Amino acid sequence: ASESETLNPSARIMTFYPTMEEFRNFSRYIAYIESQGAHRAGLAKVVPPKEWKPRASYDDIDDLVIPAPIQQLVTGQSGLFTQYNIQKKAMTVREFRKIANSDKYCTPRYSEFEELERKYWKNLTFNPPIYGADVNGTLYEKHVDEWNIGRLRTILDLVEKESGITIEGVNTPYLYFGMWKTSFAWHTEDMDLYSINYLHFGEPKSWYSVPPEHGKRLERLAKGFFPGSAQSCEAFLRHKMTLISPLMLKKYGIPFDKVTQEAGEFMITFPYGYHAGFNHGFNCAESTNFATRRWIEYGKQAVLCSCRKDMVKISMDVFVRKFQPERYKLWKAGKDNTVIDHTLPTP
Amino acid sequence: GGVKK
Ligand SMILES: O=C(O)CNC(=O)C(=O)O
Ligand SMILES: [Fe+2]
Ligand SMILES: [Zn+2]
Numbered sequence: 070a071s072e073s074e075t076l077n078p079s080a081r082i083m084t085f086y087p088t089m090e091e092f093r094n095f096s097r098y099i100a101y102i103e104s105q106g107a108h109r110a111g112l113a114k115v116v117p118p119k120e121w122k123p124r125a126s127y128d129d130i131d132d133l134v135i136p137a138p139i140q141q142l143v144t145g146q147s148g149l150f151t152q153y154n155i156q157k158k159a160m161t162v163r164e165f166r167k168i169a170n171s172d173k174y175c176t177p178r179y180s181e182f183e184e185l186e187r188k189y190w191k192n193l194t195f196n197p198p199i200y201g202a203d204v205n206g207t208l209y210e211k212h213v214d215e216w217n218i219g220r221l222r223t224i225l226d227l228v229e230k231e232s233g234i235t236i237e238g239v240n241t242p243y244l245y246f247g248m249w250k251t252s253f254a255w256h257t258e259d260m261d262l263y264s265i266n267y268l269h270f271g272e273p274k275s276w277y278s279v280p281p282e283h284g285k286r287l288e289r290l291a292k293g294f295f296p297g298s299a300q301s302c303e304a305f306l307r308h309k310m311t312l313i314s315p316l317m318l319k320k321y322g323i324p325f326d327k328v329t330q331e332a333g334e335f336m337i338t339f340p341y342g343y344h345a346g347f348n349h350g351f352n353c354a355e356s357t358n359f360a361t362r363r364w365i366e367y368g369k370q371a372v373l374c375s376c377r378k379d380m381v382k383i384s385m386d387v388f389v390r391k392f393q394p395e396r397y398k399l400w401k402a403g404k405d406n407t408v409i410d411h412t413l414p415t416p
Numbered sequence: 417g418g419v420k421k
Pocket of ligand 3: 302304305308374375376377
């Protein structure tokens with residue numbers, strides 16, 4: 070407890086309301102929320118100054134093409150499930166919005182979130198919804214320079230700068246069109262990077278998050294529930310097919326917090342922060358990964374999936390060399406035994 | 417290298 074641990078001790082999901090002045094410098098504001106211990110929860114919400122907008126209106130996107138929509142079939146019981154993504158032929162936002170609003174895939178009625186949440190976990194294996202996910206592109210207007218997911222200017226840019234390598238969705242923007250019951254399984258970002266998520270419009274998106282500080286406990290639980298998957302790939306959670314309900318988490322003592330993201334709101338996940346969730350109804354979100362100096366250690370130690378050969382792999386070399394010159398030689402000879410303090414901020 | 421999706 071050296072002042073680092075005395076900040077956000079409960080490691081709960083914090084919400085920030087930055088002035089246009091603070092909102093202007095992305096990397097600075099991130100370092101700030103971390104100074105407030107936001108990273109402990111693994112997830113943070115950031116409501117942008119009310120007069121800020123990245124687009125005039127979205128009446129034009131009804132034409133946009135979702136080249137690879139996916140149908141989410143879920144199999145499981147008792148709070149433990151495996152999600153299988155079936156790919157469907159391309160479609161336009163209108164065709165998607167049509168099915169999303171249809172009485173068949175429409176959001177059910179309810180009073181309090183607590184009830185909408187109970188219905189999610191009761192019916193996620195029924196009526197396989199369609200998710201227009203991982204669509205390359207952005208909805209930000211070319212002139213927006215504040216928190217533009219298309220050009221955040223973090224050190225993650227070094228990947229491209231140094232090698233020309235493009236990793237769709239990681240160092241490029243991704244759009245997600247969801248409907249009721251579409252969901253994202255438990256996972257940390259590729260290479261355990263940070264992620265930014267802006268909900269452009271539509272119904273809310275709810276999130277579940279486990280503090281990085283307890284990430285390994287979630288992995289051990291997951292391994293035990295799916296021993297078959299764990300042995301064919303240690304990092305099987307990166308397959309993004311595992312769903313675990315909050316009740317199961319509660320039952321096994323795994324700390325977590327929940328939050329619901331509204332339209333016009335930003336969500337930030339931190340290195341090694343496990344998260345999962347679902348969409349309330351029709352909506353549109355844009356996202357990408359980013360990095361900070363603090364990420365470097367996480368990147369060096371990220372446990373990657375090796376069973377699939379198309380998984381995101383980033384050479385850490387350029388980062389250690391440039392930001393950890395004193396350790397480059399040691400790390401290269403695999404003798405860098407740096408232990409990571411999840412509560413610590415980049416001092 | 418790699419890709420999301
Ligand atoms: O949109 C989704 O289903 C999931 N989005 C994320 O996990 C993210 O932006 O970090
Ligand atoms: Fe994520
Ligand atoms: Zn794997």
